[PDB]
Amino acid sequence: QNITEEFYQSTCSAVSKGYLSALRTGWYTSVITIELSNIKENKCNGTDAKVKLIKQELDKYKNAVTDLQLLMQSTPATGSGSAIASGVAVCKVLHLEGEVNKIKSALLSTNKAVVSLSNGVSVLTSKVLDLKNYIDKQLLPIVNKQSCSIPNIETVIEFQQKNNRLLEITREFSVNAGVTTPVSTYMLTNSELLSLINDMPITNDQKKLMSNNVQIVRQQSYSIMCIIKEEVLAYVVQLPLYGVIDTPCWKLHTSPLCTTNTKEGSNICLTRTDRGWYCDNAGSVSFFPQAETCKVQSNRVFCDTMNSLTLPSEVNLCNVDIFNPKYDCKIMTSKTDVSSSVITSLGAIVSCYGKTKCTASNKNRGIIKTFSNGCDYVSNKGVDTVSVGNTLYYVNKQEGKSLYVKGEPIINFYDPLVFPSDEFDASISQVNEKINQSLAFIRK
Amino acid sequence: QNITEEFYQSTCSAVSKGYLSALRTGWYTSVITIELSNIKENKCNGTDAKVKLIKQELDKYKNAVTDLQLLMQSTPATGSGSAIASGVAVCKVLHLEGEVNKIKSALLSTNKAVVSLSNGVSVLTSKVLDLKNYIDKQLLPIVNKQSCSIPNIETVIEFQQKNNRLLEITREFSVNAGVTTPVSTYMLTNSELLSLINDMPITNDQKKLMSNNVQIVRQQSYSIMCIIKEEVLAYVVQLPLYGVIDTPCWKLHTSPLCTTNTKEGSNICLTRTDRGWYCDNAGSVSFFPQAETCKVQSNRVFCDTMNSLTLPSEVNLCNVDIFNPKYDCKIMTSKTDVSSSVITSLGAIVSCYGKTKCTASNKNRGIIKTFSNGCDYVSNKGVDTVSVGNTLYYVNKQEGKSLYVKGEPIINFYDPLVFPSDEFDASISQVNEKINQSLAFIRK
Amino acid sequence: QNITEEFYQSTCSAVSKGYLSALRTGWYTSVITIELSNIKENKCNGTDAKVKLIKQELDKYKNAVTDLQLLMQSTPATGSGSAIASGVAVCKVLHLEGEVNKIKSALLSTNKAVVSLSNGVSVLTSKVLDLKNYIDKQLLPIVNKQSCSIPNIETVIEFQQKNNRLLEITREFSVNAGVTTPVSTYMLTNSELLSLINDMPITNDQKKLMSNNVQIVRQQSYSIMCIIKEEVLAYVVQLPLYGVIDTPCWKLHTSPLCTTNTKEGSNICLTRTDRGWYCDNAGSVSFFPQAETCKVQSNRVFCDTMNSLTLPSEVNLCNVDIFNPKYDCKIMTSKTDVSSSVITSLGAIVSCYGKTKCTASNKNRGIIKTFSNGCDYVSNKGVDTVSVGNTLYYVNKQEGKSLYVKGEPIINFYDPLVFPSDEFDASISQVNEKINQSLAFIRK
Ligand SMILES: *[C@@H]1O[C@H](CO)[C@@H](O)[C@H](O)[C@H]1NC(C)=O
Ligand SMILES: *[C@@H]1O[C@H](CO)[C@@H](O)[C@H](O)[C@H]1NC(C)=O
Ligand SMILES: *[C@@H]1O[C@H](CO)[C@@H](O)[C@H](O)[C@H]1NC(C)=O
């Protein structure tokens, strides 16, 4: 609840603390059915515009069904099989003879129903749309006569309204080769999603968590097209199960740390690597290197462990002692002293080099801080913007406390002559070993 | 048809074989026309709601036309000119005086027609929508009187249905600066695409191939907005021509290969580079380094040669002898021993290091394999999942045969003291030359 | 207006000149309101289809309002706070008691109106849709009786037309966690955008610039959901302010430059780094490293300075003398001699190595140029395509003048034995210092 931050002047890095986890560790698959009409062409002597409008909407229904049939013949390998493997196993079961008859029997009287498939998966099925009932009762008497009977204009509008969701679902499944994410309101309405969450074999706090973050749940869910067979359209919705909840999470921010000599070509740089989200998980730390894999709402991070690395908990000691022997703190080295800034959760890191004009301003007071050459930091308390060169960044105005941990920039502990300056994935001990090797080649 | 796999224990890499190619090497451009109405405002004494609804839909038609006019004045350079250059050459021809009169004459009696343009391109043109006929015959008598005549509600609904495709096409062309990909059903319906494929100057197996993979064809096609001029809206659809068909294709998978000493800081790593899709092509190999450039359907890969590299066929010998003098097998080196796994076509590579808990399970039996430190592999036969640290991966359940090629991990052939450990783009011979240089600097 | 190009044979790089800048340096926020109906359920004895259709569309209105309410309770941190910080500051003001009453008073008589908020921001507000007027006057008398009165079918269609924009706006704000970019025509119609631009506190040439590039303006704008409160739906549109206009801009193109010895393993390579867009800006140069951050229309580049680096103007001297002491020209080194090509603004760079078949053709004449081993270039005058290996590239047919600046490839000035060949981010002086160090270790 209380967000705090710590800037480390020695390593030009900051850690944003106080975040709570929700890591996806499991999947809950659910079958969504649409009752279809196995209509055949019913051309009759037709002229008045209402029959034409009905026949037009009926052809749009007919093309949607044939499009789903060619879509289910070809199932592309191009999805990420490791993240849809559950639902794909259910679709392979659905292709069995008699399984669609089973779901067809369970949704015979109600819209929602639990169905035990023939593979040990107790899935929750839904009937979200009933087009066979509408077409066979309200439309077929209209095109199964000698001359077509005249339907009312209310029927034309209601049929375009009901048929619309089938057409949009066929559009999403067609452009995405049967696998869509996020899951749209066409695939599952917010009302249907909340009812599906409420009916899940999870704790009540987990139902409240997923119900209060339905948009994040949609962004971390998949919709997989199964089969169109025997007047039934079935597709699987894969919802995330957050097996890791309320564990401490923190975000590491890094920026280049160079020396600030006045003669160009004589400066060396180092930047901590592995910036991103860290969360405590089962005696280890789950690290998320890609920036788009974790959604934050309030102080809660919602990550997928599929794109994480598992690190020893000693990885946090790079934040307290980068020179600590329990974990080899990783860095990259260079000579690229271009000024830059990183907007953190509660402030801004500024790496100012060369002649760059770096400053921090308040909207009404003007410049309140001028950065000197090196790596520095400013909290969001009293600061609105940070300007670096010709770029203006805005500071996050979120409430919290920042702590400036003063310390000597560690780049000053290195003799420039023997520094390894172009290391793209090194470590503190890796650099020290390359330096020990250059001192033995130079002593003789 | 038969998918096979080979895991190389010596290099921590796997090759998935048996795939057939379809590489895009050409473009087939086609002109899609929409007959428009050069209507002018026709405000008359109007009150009843049906005239207002018609006038509202007519203004939505009017804004769509002016939006396309400002869209064709500004053609952004931001597209990738090298992949739309064909259609852009056709749009430059269409801007000539009299060329729209030519297509206007060919689609005078039929919907589809071949047109020889004034630049030597024999394009296939289509009339997919006729709004000038509908507006000038059914709507203008309704707003060209002293007082507007009253149109029936069927006319209001039919006009919103016909005008809809124009409005959606204007939306896609507006948000994408005139160049859209993939090509939506609004740009070209599946029925129109299949008819366009069938009418193409290609072999019958190529028409069957593109017709059975229409969604992949859409994802590898472009729609370019040409011109709105003289009651004609024209835009080019660029369809892929697969000049390379049924050549062997294979997918290389790589994972870090480190030594497993018990003292941290004493281990060295190496990873094969250039993982991805390889296809035999014209006496050479077409390599696709980016992961999203090749769509797989069944055992067929559909790539665009635009994002390929051409390599000598000897590049396959990195799979049989990484130490082979005909091709310099490329690697990258490091000391980053973080555990990870790679899901292949028929199994999983696991690089287990440190204290990470790596295992392979069956859904009902539990843990059936525990990986030791190093790089190892498991087939999908009897394995459902692979757990590495806090992450659970699912194995692809596709049928095929895997071959575990046992061999000494080549990282064990290197003396750690003189190994080059931070090489970001090296080669087997590059590393040996850096080692020969470190042994001459150490012998003295 | 006149686009020119310069190919540097010595460094295998080209510079496309003559482009004019438009850099985003500020934001103009604007409030978009939708007058809503605080209706409550009004179930009455209803049977005929017109009441059902109205009640159905009313439930779609009701769900859209509750979806926006749960959307405004949860505001995700996941947006990029530094680029939405303006609008977020306005939304925080809008959440104050009485501020929605202020905008509700200013849009009491007109659609557009300037409103001075209680935070010093003089925002331009708009009333783009009026659903409270339509529902309370045309719909409530239809469900506030003993038995529902019968509405005409025109009312059903007009209500689905008016309610549609609310439903689409709720869809975009829901899938994107309240922050959408680009800004759709649903968020702001082209007519409303042009009227908002015209009413902006900017010069007349800036109104003409943004009005002639509305699609680029949309792609560089943000729509942020604020609050739904007291029969008012408010959201902020953030439009770009281009503080840098008509400054010279140029695009740097680079390609690998290797030696062409006949014995593999004896060749060294070097590639200039920092390819992309450069624009003169306030006595410095704004560099844009990512490829998708700058949209080009004609000869004008539209960039966001948010994703730029500020460089000394001496960075242009890498184009005139890469060996020039005022700026340390950056390079990367390797031994990866794979053939490739780069399509420039007026031609094509070709790096041909090994046995690769590189050629340049005219559509009707055939092969007009065969590249030898090394880095070379061809203008678009007389050339249509460039083939490298199995890949065919199309040359941009834009009019301009190219200049081939002959010069010795600088890779030939380096002794291969002491060259640093795996540098991932080096510089000309960095390489010379590593060479000076290898010559001192070899002289003894
Ligand atoms: C470098 O030498 C020092 C001095 O003995 C030693 O303490 C340190 O551990 C060495 N570093 C490496 C990486 O071997
Ligand atoms: C390294 O030296 C050995 C021994 O003569 C030789 O066989 C090998 O080719 C050399 N490697 C390189 C890259 O020069
Ligand atoms: C390398 O040595 C030469 C010869 O004195 C000198 O001119 C040059 O500046 C040196 N380069 C570096 C990077 O120190």
**Sequence-distant (≥ 6) Cβ neighbours of residue A432 within 8 angstroms:** none
DSSP A151-189: --HHHHHHHHHHHHHHHHHHHHHHHTTTEESS--TTTS-
Burial B387-402 (b: 16+ CB within 10 A, else e): bbbbbbbbbbeeebeb
**CB count in 10 Å sphere of residue C172:** 17
SS3 B50: helix
Q: Please tell me if the CB atom of residue B293 comes closer than 6 angstroms to any atom of ligand 2.
A: no
Q: Are B106 and B113 in contact (CB under 8 A)?
A: yes
- In 3D space, the residue among A301, A377, A384 whose CA is nearest the CA of residue C81 turns out to be A384
In one-letter notation, the amino acid at residue A213 is N
**How far away is chain A from the Cα of B168, in angstroms, using its nearest Cα?**
13
Ligand nearest to the CA of A264: 3
For residue B190, list chain A residues with Cβ-Cβ distance below 8 A.
63, 67, 174
Q: What are phi and psi of A423, to 5 degrees?
A: -90, 125
Would you call B390 and A308 a contact, using CB atoms and an 8 Å cutoff? yes
Would you call C306 and A339 a contact, using CB atoms and an 8 Å cutoff? no
How far lies C123's CA from each of A392, C29, C98, C118, C240, in Å?
A: 21, 7, 16, 11, 14
The CA distance from B379 to B404, in Å, is: 9
What token pair was written down for B125?
């043109």
Of the candidates C53, C86, C430, which has its C-beta nearest A154's C-beta? C53
Q: Are A102 and A94 in contact (CB under 8 A)?
A: no
The CA distance from C146 to A404, in Å, is: 69
Would you call C297 and B78 a contact, using CB atoms and an 8 Å cutoff? yes
Q: Please tell me if the CB atom of residue A430 comes closer than 6 angstroms to any atom of ligand 1.
A: no
Ligand nearest to the CA of A426: 1
Q: Are B236 and B180 in contact (CB under 8 A)?
A: no
Considering A191, A222, A244, which residue would you say is the last residue of a domain?
A: A244
Q: What are phi and psi of A73, to 5 degrees?
A: -65, -45
For residue B436, list chain C residues with Cβ-Cβ distance below 8 A.
none
Establish if C243 belongs to a structural domain: no
User: Atom 4 in ligand 3: which residue has the minimum CA distance?
Assistant: C436
Helix (H) or strand (E) holding B164: helix B153-175
Establish if C241 belongs to a structural domain: no
In one-letter notation, the amino acid at residue B26 is G
DSSP state of B185: T
DSSP state of A45: B
Q: Which long-range contacts (CB under 8 A, 24 or more apart) does A16-19 make?
A: A16/A250, A16/A251, A16/A253, A16/A344, A16/A345, A16/A346, A17/A248, A17/A250, A18/A248, A18/A250, A18/A299, A18/A400, A19/A248, A19/A249, A19/A250, A19/A251, A19/A279, A19/A296, A19/A299, A19/A300, A19/A301
Sign of CA dihedral B388, B393, B394, B396: negative
Task: Give the count of Cβ contacts less than 8 A between chain A and C.
Answer: 123
CA of B434 to the centre of ligand 2 (A): 10
Whether omega for the bond prior to residue C182 falls within 30 degrees of 0, making it cis, is yes
A240 and A254 assigned to the same domain: no
Considering C164, C198, C230, which residue would you say is the last residue of a domain?
A: C230
Q: Please tell me if the CB atom of residue C437 comes closer than 6 angstroms to any atom of ligand 3.
A: no
B184 and B295 assigned to the same domain: no
C16 and C102 assigned to the same domain: no
- In 3D space, the residue among C194, C221, C291 whose CA is nearest the CA of residue C251 turns out to be C291
Chains in touch with B (3+ beta-carbon pairs under 8 Å) read A, C
The CA distance from A4 to A248, in Å, is: 12
The CA distance from A238 to A180, in Å, is: 11
Chain A residue nearest residue B333, CA to CA: A425
Would you call C265 and B328 a contact, using CB atoms and an 8 Å cutoff? yes
What token pair was written down for C29?
């926020």
C15 and C49 assigned to the same domain: no
Sheet holding A391-394, edge to edge: A366-370, A358-362, A385-388, A391-394
A271 and A222 assigned to the same domain: no
The CA distance from B55 to B67, in Å, is: 18
Ligand 1 atom having least distance to the Cα of A436: 1
**How far away is chain C from the Cα of B78, in angstroms, using its nearest Cα?**
5
C225 and C258 assigned to the same domain: no
The CA distance from C182 to C201, in Å, is: 22
Q: What are phi and psi of A158, to 5 degrees?
A: -65, -30
How far lies A388's CA from each of A336, A356, C247, C302, in Å?
A: 16, 7, 20, 20
Chain B residue nearest residue A177, CA to CA: B215
- In 3D space, the residue among A200, A86, A96 whose CA is nearest the CA of residue B363 turns out to be A86
How far lies B161's CA from each of A400, B57, B129, B234, B402, in Å?
A: 54, 10, 11, 20, 54
The CA distance from A396 to A16, in Å, is: 12
Resolution in A: 2.3
Q: Are C245 and C271 in contact (CB under 8 A)?
A: no
The CA distance from A413 to A395, in Å, is: 32
Domain extent at residue A207: 28-244
B415: left (phi > 0), else alpha (psi -120 to 50), else beta?
beta
The CA distance from A154 to C48, in Å, is: 9
* Number of folded domains that form chain C: 2
**How far away is chain A from the Cα of B209, in angstroms, using its nearest Cα?**
12
Sole residue written with tokens 């496309």: C16
A53 and A182 assigned to the same domain: yes
- In 3D space, the residue among A79, A421, A58, A4 whose CA is nearest the CA of residue A251 turns out to be A4
B217 and B315 assigned to the same domain: no
A404 and A343 assigned to the same domain: yes
**CB count in 10 Å sphere of residue A59:** 12
The CA distance from B331 to B340, in Å, is: 18
Sole residue written with tokens 């709720």: C170
Of the candidates B74, B120, B171, which has its C-beta nearest C212's C-beta? B74
Q: Please tell me if the CB atom of residue B432 comes closer than 6 angstroms to any atom of ligand 2.
A: yes
A200 and A261 assigned to the same domain: no
Would you call C397 and B49 a contact, using CB atoms and an 8 Å cutoff? no
The CA distance from C61 to C45, in Å, is: 21
**CB count in 10 Å sphere of residue A304:** 18
Ligand 3 atom having least distance to the Cα of C429: 13
3-state secondary structure chain C: CCCEEEEECCCCEEEEEEEEEEEEEEEEEEEEEEECCCCCCCCCECCCHHHHHHHHHHHHHHHHHHHHHHHHHCCECCCCHHHHHHHHHHHHHHCCCCHHHHHHHHCCCCCEEEEECCCCCEEEEEEEEEHHHHHHHHHHHHHCCCECCCCCHHHHHHHHHHHHHHHHHHHHHHHCCCEECCCCCCCCCHHHHHHHHHCCCCCHHHHHHHHHCHHHHHHCCEEEEEEECCCEEEEEEEEEEEEEEEEEEEEEEECCEECCCCCCCCCCEEEECCCEEEEEECCEEEEECCHHHEEEECCEEEEEHHHCEEECHHHHHHCCCCCCCCCCCEEEEECCCCCEEEECCCEEEEEECCCCCEEEEECCCEEEEECCCEEEEEECCCCCEEEECCEEEECCCCCCEEEEECCCCHHHHCCCCCCCCCCCCEEHHHHHHHHHHHHHHHHC
The CA distance from B178 to A390, in Å, is: 32
Chain B residue nearest residue A313, CA to CA: B355
DSSP state of A12: T
For residue A390, list chain C residues with Cβ-Cβ distance below 8 A.
25, 244, 281-282, 284, 286, 305, 308, 310
For residue B153, list chain A residues with Cβ-Cβ distance below 8 A.
153
What token pair was written down for B344?
């292949």
To test the pocket of ligand 2, the residue of B427, B433, B443 to mutate (highest count of ligand atoms within 8 Å of its CB) is B433
Q: Please tell me if the CB atom of residue C433 comes closer than 6 angstroms to any atom of ligand 3.
A: yes
B224 and B265 assigned to the same domain: no
Sole residue written with tokens 């509405």: C151
Ligand nearest to the CA of C325: 3
Q: Are B143 and B155 in contact (CB under 8 A)?
A: no
Would you call B81 and C394 a contact, using CB atoms and an 8 Å cutoff? yes
CA of C433 to the centre of ligand 3 (A): 7
Whether omega for the bond prior to residue B409 falls within 30 degrees of 0, making it cis, is no
Considering B244, B263, B293, which residue would you say is the last residue of a domain?
A: B244
To test the pocket of ligand 2, the residue of B432, B435, B438 to mutate (highest count of ligand atoms within 8 Å of its CB) is B432
To test the pocket of ligand 3, the residue of C427, C431, C433 to mutate (highest count of ligand atoms within 8 Å of its CB) is C433
Ligand nearest to the CA of A323: 1
**How far away is chain B from the Cα of C432, in angstroms, using its nearest Cα?**
18
The CA distance from C389 to C368, in Å, is: 16
**Sequence-distant (≥ 6) Cβ neighbours of residue A123 within 8 angstroms:** A29, A30, A31, A90, A114, A115, A117
Establish if C411 belongs to a structural domain: yes
A204 and A274 assigned to the same domain: no
What token pair was written down for B350?
């696991």
Establish if C206 belongs to a structural domain: no
User: Atom 4 in ligand 2: which residue has the minimum CA distance?
Assistant: B436
What token pair was written down for C269?
């390579």
- In 3D space, the residue among B35, B123, B126 whose CA is nearest the CA of residue B87 turns out to be B123
The CA distance from C426 to C261, in Å, is: 24
For residue C354, list chain B residues with Cβ-Cβ distance below 8 A.
312
